[PDB]
Design a protein around this ligand. Structure first.
Ligand SMILES: CN(C)c1ncnc2nc[nH]c12
Length: 218
């Protein structure tokens, strides 16, 4: 008795290409010698704050949207053994469609405009002004994993090593309830951001007036 599941039904792991504009920016960011790489943390905390604003805005008319979790917070978890730095927020999260669209497609206009601005003398720290600060994670990360849960969909995982493609798959792991977890697999030369002394310095310098609690976990 040796059965075989010739066809699993849905495709578990789906691979897609970035819009060319996004892929070219990711290549720029992952290989640049820009000396102020710490700004990645500002951009990711700002994205987390925006996501928390969103859920809060939504709950004003429908308090039940907080049934998946009442606390609105940001957590930063450096992990020296796995060389990961994780930023967790309990914000709005992303459905599967929005996950593919928001990280793989809709950033096209922002990444295009940002690269034109860079060509004309702008600098990388302005990335957030084009709505695409998420990709600054590749200043310090060789790989990024995003775990996300939106009230209207199941938990999903996104990942990319900036090779022009990304993958999406249902995540049946530890439920996060609601929100997004951005997991940075750090480059060898950027492990300074695994140290509590360094991470605090960056938060105090760049994110000292964010309207949500930021907790650091060692
Ligand atoms: C980057 N992006 C589209 C995001 N969407 C929703 N929640 C987020 N938390 C951090 N980044 C997020």
């Amino acid at each position: 008795h040796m059965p075989e599941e010739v066809h699993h039904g849905e495709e578990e792991v789906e691979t897609f290409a970035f819009q060319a504009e996004i892929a070219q920016l990711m290549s720029l960011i992952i290989n640049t010698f820009y000396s102020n790489k710490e700004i990645f943390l500002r951009e990711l905390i700002s994205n987390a704050s925006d996501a928390l604003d969103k859920i809060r805005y939504e709950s004003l008319t429908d308090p039940s949207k907080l049934d998946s979790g009442k606390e609105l917070k940001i957590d930063i978890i450096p992990n020296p053994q796995e060389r990961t730095l994780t930023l967790v927020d309990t914000g709005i999260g992303m459905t599967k469609a929005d996950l593919i669209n928001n990280l793989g497609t809709i950033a096209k206009s922002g990444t295009k405009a940002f690269m034109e601005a860079l060509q004309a003398g702008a600098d990388i720290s302005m990335i957030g002004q084009f709505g695409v600060g998420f990709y600054s994670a590749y200043l310090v990360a060789e790989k990024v994993v995003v775990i996300t849960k939106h009230n209207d969909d199941e938990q999903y995982a996104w990942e990319s090593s900036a090779g022009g493609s990304f993958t999406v798959r249902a995540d049946h792991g530890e439920p996060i309830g609601r929100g997004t977890k951005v997991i940075l697999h750090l480059k060898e030369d950027q492990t300074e951001y695994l140290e509590e002394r360094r991470v605090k310095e960056v938060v105090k310098k760049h994110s000292q007036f964010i309207g949500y609690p930021i907790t650091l976990y060692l």
